[PDB]
Amino acid sequence: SEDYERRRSECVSEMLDLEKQFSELKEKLFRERLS
Amino acid sequence: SEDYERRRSECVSEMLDLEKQFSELKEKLFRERLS
Amino acid sequence: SECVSEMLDLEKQFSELK
Amino acid sequence: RSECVSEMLDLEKQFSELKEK
Amino acid sequence: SECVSEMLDLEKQFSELKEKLFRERLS
Amino acid sequence: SECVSEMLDLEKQFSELKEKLFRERLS
Amino acid sequence: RSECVSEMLDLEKQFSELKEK
Amino acid sequence: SECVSEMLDLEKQFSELK
Ligand SMILES: [Cl-]
Ligand SMILES: [Cl-]
């Protein structure tokens, strides 16, 4: 058997994590460029 | 006299605030669309 | 500030939208 | 009636001003 | 109206700048 | 290499989806 | 040598898979 | 998970980039 939704969620959570790192960098660059 | 940099910073801070509201909505929509 | 009062208006409208 | 437009326009210009140079 | 199309115009400018900054800091 | 051009490709897909979602939830 | 490319490709496909339907 | 191990690699490379 395969816990398809558990596995899906672990993958989603990693993508969310990487995308929040990208976003944090974009927000830093935005604030630095305007300040 | 005009505290040009103080005034500039208050304007910048508001723009940062509005843009963080927009970002929070985009992040909510992203997570909901992937989950 | 004009920049600040207008942004506050915009922040309010974005809140109401949501 | 129509700050939406007027305000957007002004804030658009202020944003260009802030990210210049 | 709570300014929707104009709010979109502005958010678009912010997002375009963020994408350009990211690409530049990295490229 | 720490994968830079490929990291940009992916971030671009994420940002494009976020812009589409925002526009849709609001339009 | 080159997971960068291979990994990007796989994760690109996984991202399309996740946002489908 | 393949998705997870690859993402962790990508997260590490993004950290190293910074
Ligand atoms: Cl399992
Ligand atoms: Cl003053």
Curated annotation (Swiss-Prot), chains C, H:
Location(s) in or outside the cell: Nucleus; Cytoplasm
Record's comment on post-translational modification: Ubiquitinated by a cullin-RING-based BCR (BTB-CUL3-RBX1) E3 ubiquitin-protein ligase complex containing SPOP, leading to proteasomal degradation.
Tissue/organ expression: Expression levels are higher in term placentas than in early placentas. Low levels of expression observed in normal pregnancies and in molar pregnancies.
Function statement: Transcriptional repressor. Down-regulates transcription activation by NF-kappa-B by promoting the deacetylation of RELA at 'Lys-310'. Promotes HDAC1 binding to promoter regions. Down-regulates expression of anti-apoptotic genes that are controlled by NF-kappa-B. Promotes apoptosis in cells that have inadequate adherence to a substrate, a process called anoikis, and may thereby inhibit metastasis. May be a mediator of metastasis suppression in breast carcinoma.
Domain notes: Contains an N-terminal anti-parallel coiled coil formed by two BRMS1 chains; this region can form homohexamers.
Subunit structure: Homohexamer (Potential). Interacts with SNX6, HDAC1 and RELA. Interacts with ARID4A. Identified in mSin3A corepressor complexes together with SIN3A, SIN3B, RBBP4, RBBP7, SAP30, SUDS3, ARID4A, HDAC1 and HDAC2. Interacts with SPOP; this recruits the protein to a ubiquitin ligase complex containing SPOP and CUL3.
Family: Belongs to the BRMS1 family.
Protein's name according to its UniProt entry: Breast cancer metastasis-suppressor 1
Lineage: Eukaryota, Metazoa, Chordata, Craniata, Vertebrata
Gene: BRMS1
Part of the intact protein present: 58 to 75 of 246
